[PDB]
Amino acid sequence: HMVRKQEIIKVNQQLIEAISNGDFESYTKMCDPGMTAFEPEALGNLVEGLDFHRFYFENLWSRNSKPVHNTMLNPHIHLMGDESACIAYIRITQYLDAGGIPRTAQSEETRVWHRRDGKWQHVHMHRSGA
């Protein structure tokens, strides 16, 4: 069990890493093309596909001049058979504002994973917090 929960923890860390670096290629590689997302930026609408996030990679997140640290705190992993997983955690984002003063942001994240063709694929996420 625990080895499989650490498997989900690893790929989710890699997923958050592509967000911090702005690596949309690795982000796409880990996401199922038909994934859905509930996100504050989407104004309460469910968004399907990776278009809504590509616009954030191409602009705000590719400004990689700034440094960012994303901490996953106390991830709770639900295993549902050998093929499905759901991980839930508090996400702490450390970044620099305009002027270079360090600041932190909190968001709660639920991410659902399904293993398709022997590879973990991210099929649905839900984030709350600005």
Q: Shortest gap between Cβ of 55 and a copy of itself (angstroms)?
A: 4
d(CA 48, CA 35): 6
102-116 β-sheet, strand order = 46-48, 31-38, 119-128, 102-116, 84-96, 69-80
Q: Which residues bind a copy of itself (CB under 8 A)?
A: 34, 36, 38, 40-48, 51-52, 54-56, 58-60, 63, 67, 69, 71, 73-74, 76, 78, 80-84, 86, 88-90, 92, 94, 96, 98-102, 104-106, 108, 110, 112, 114, 123-124, 126-129
Nearer Cβ to a copy of itself (10/108): 108
CA distances from 36 to 4, 40, 49, 93, 104 (A): 24, 13, 6, 22, 26
Site string for K ion, 65-104 (x = CB under 5 A): ----------------------------------------
